[PDB]
Design a protein around this motif. Structure first.
Motif, mmCIF file in Angstrom:
data_model
loop_
_atom_site.group_PDB
_atom_site.id
_atom_site.type_symbol
_atom_site.label_atom_id
_atom_site.label_comp_id
_atom_site.label_asym_id
_atom_site.label_seq_id
_atom_site.Cartn_x
_atom_site.Cartn_y
_atom_site.Cartn_z
ATOM 1 N N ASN A 124 15.430 3.982 -0.037
ATOM 2 C CA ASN A 124 14.159 3.228 0.215
ATOM 3 C C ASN A 124 13.098 3.768 -0.742
ATOM 4 N N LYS A 127 6.317 3.303 -0.888
ATOM 5 C CA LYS A 127 5.347 2.206 -0.938
ATOM 6 C C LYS A 127 3.976 2.601 -1.498
ATOM 7 N N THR A 128 3.701 3.838 -1.478
ATOM 8 C CA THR A 128 2.493 4.505 -1.863
ATOM 9 C C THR A 128 2.729 5.692 -2.809
ATOM 10 N N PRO A 248 4.048 1.356 -6.391
ATOM 11 C CA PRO A 248 3.459 1.867 -5.161
ATOM 12 C C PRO A 248 1.936 1.598 -5.119
ATOM 13 N N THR A 249 1.356 1.603 -3.979
ATOM 14 C CA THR A 249 -0.089 1.381 -3.780
ATOM 15 C C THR A 249 -0.862 2.647 -3.947
#
Ligand SMILES: OC[C@H]1O[C@H](O[C@H]2[C@H](O)[C@@H](O)[C@@H](O[C@H]3[C@H](O)[C@@H](O)[C@@H](O)O[C@@H]3CO)O[C@@H]2CO)[C@H](O)[C@@H](O)[C@@H]1O
Length: 370
Positions: A124, A127-128, A248-249
């Motif tokens: 996975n 995301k950040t 990623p954010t």
């Protein structure tokens, strides 16, 4: 003093120049004129030098950002296709190649940077950006790193600088304001500071370049890299099981890559303008000509609607478009080369510790605005 009856093409060494050469190869098998494709070093800085002198290639390929400077300097022929041909391409792509309302190049492909990860090392992806330092601490324990990417070229670092608010030139009426630069605002300083910190905390090295990051990932020693479509061919031959996804954010906002439009310009000084046109419109800009280049090194999302239709199905292309959507199309104004040079020094001086983030972005802002 270019030699009529042949086509000499200049393309960057990271693109599918062998596939391009096959496209010219059946240009010549069917038109008698030989096409020679070269990939000189720093071609983008050399072109204005020899083109100036009435020399250089017939056709020059580069992302659209360098084209407004070439057009201003009088080095490019205005291209005039026709509405049926123009219709074959996405409209935003011809907008990227318009300089003072005139078209000065053919759009080829839309490039955007994505996050590439080793599924075997990280099923996975994060995301950040913020969870990257803890992730590095676990892989390090097992002898690997979380991420390595080219730090030497500002193109790679801009998505993070831009995430929280940095910008190049404010677009105000339908004009870019060259005095309103966002390289030294709170957004740009927060992103650059996070980068420097990854460095100071030993999660990344200040000297990583394109080669080192590409070998590290191709060899399985780093779980992730940040790169464009052109890099996929080398990852395939390495057999890493990789994924391509959304960047990623940072502080809750999407990483915002500068989006580039690979474009082909015709040297103003060529006696082969119509052959050039023949070559680009009837050979390269076809499903067959684009396919040939793409086999060599993937182009990204192409400008030709027909072929893009075939490509869009590939999740790597879907991730490419998603990051392009979150990003901004680069300006093509002459001032883009001053912007890139200033930001390149700011990032190397900040990452190396030769200047603090605040002194590095303030100098850049100064330099870009005069
Ligand atoms: O940093 C100095 C460098 O700045 C300018 O180069 C920028 C390119 O003009 C711009 O297109 C972009 O380049 C990327 C290409 O779009 C992409 O296809 C792929 O080839 O990677 C390039 C990044 O290595 O970003 C760079 C800035 O990093 C200027 O034009 C150069 O002359 C100058 O050396």
């Amino acid at each position: 003093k270019i030699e009529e009856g042949k086509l000499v093409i200049w393309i960057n060494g990271d693109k599918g120049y062998n596939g391009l050469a096959e496209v010219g190869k059946k240009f010549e098998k069917d038109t008698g004129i030989k096409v020679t494709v070269e990939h000189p070093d720093k071609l983008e800085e050399k072109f204005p030098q020899v083109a100036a002198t009435g020399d250089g290639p017939d056709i020059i390929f580069w992302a659209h950002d360098r084209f407004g400077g070439y057009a201003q300097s009088g080095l490019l022929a205005e291209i005039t296709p026709d509405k049926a041909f123009q219709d074959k391409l996405y409209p935003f792509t011809w907008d990227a190649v318009r300089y003072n309302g005139k078209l000065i190049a053919y759009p080829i492909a839309v490039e955007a940077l994505s996050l590439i990860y080793n599924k075997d090392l990280l099923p996975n992806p994060p995301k950040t950006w913020e969870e990257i330092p803890a992730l590095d601490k676990e892989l390090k324990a097992k002898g690997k790193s979380a991420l390595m990417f080219n730090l030497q070229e500002p193109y790679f670092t801009w998505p993070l600088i831009a995430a929280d608010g940095g910008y190049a030139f404010k677009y105000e009426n339908g004009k870019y304001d060259i005095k309103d630069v966002g390289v030294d605002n709170a957004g740009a300083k927060a992103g650059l500071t996070f980068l420097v910190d990854l460095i100071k905390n030993k999660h990344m090295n200040a000297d990583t370049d394109y080669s080192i990051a590409e070998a590290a990932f191709n060899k399985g020693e780093t779980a992730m890299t940040i790169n464009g479509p052109w890099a996929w061919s080398n990852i395939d031959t390495s057999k890493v099981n990789y994924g391509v996804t959304v960047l990623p954010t940072f502080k809750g906002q999407p990483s915002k890559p500068f989006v580039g439009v690979l474009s082909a310009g015709i040297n103003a000084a060529s006696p082969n303008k119509e052959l050039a046109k023949e070559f680009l419109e009837n050979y390269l800009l076809t499903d067959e000509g684009l396919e040939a280049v793409n086999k060599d090194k993937p182009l990204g999302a192409v400008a030709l609607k027909s072929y893009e239709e075939e490509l869009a199905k590939d999740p790597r292309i879907a991730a490419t478009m998603e990051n392009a959507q979150k990003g901004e199309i680069m300006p093509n104004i002459p001032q883009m080369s001053a912007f890139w040079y200033a930001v390149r020094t700011a990032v190397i001086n900040a990452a190396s510790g030769r200047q603090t983030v605040d002194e590095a972005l303030k100098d850049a802002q100064t330099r870009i605005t005069k």
